[PDB]
Chain A
């Protein structure tokens, strides 16, 4: 799968969904399979890379707690 990184795939999904609540893990887990190329452990690596963009601060979490809920980027 000739693909970007999983720190620039969720960031290239939110910039394409100008939503005041954000883009959810179930609006991202769809975007990643439709447009780009992805393998089969995709819905398990989106999740594993929205706990490594929450604890850092790369990605902000409006309503939710963990990997279930909706997020958007910092500014």
Chain B
């Protein structure tokens, strides 16, 4: 459930913590699985691009920069890993 299904490593109480930052008071049970689903889709979309940047650099190791360039491409630009 946690090794070829690491998604479950996104712990109910961790998702709670996030939503608590979001200013959420009360949280449906169905949400935990929903959130996983979305996070997957997100990381999928980003990493796909990030890797694609790596594949173009003929590297087999993914860099910080690769990620940033990808996040910028998914209109989610990130400061503090070197714009």
Contact between chain A and chain B defined by CB under 8 Å: no
Q: Interface of A with B (CB < 8 Å)?
A: none
Q: Interface of B with A (CB < 8 Å)?
A: none
